[PDB]
Amino acid sequence: LSRTVHHQQTAEITQQAADFIRYMNAINDYLYQHPERRAAGGQLTSAQLGLPATKNVSHLISQQRVFVWAKEKPGLMGALLEQSGDSALLARVENGRLLDTHGRRISITLPAVIPDQVIIWMN
């Protein structure tokens, strides 16, 4: 007997977007309060975010900008937009390049530790 329920892609992206937005907002709020933290790099902690560890959203502060990202899936962009009232300003990483949502290169050098095929927020 396998009890596994397959094909839960929409449920998965719904929760991935909610997690992304939760972490994004917590990171954004902390750095808005404490802009001097940008210079140090690395990551904010679980205590600073008030959120425990998570497996489906990653972040990094580099060259005083913060980057938050998740593995791209069909409709994940639309779910992020839905759950942010169309307000999140998002981008993509493809072949080591930052692309806007219309696929045009944004000529910033990305940290080398961000993977391809993610949706990303840089702020």
UniProtKB/TrEMBL annotation:
Keywords linked to the UniProt accession: Plasmid
Species annotation: Escherichia coli
Record protein name field: PilM
Shown residues in whole-protein numbering: 23 to 145 of 145
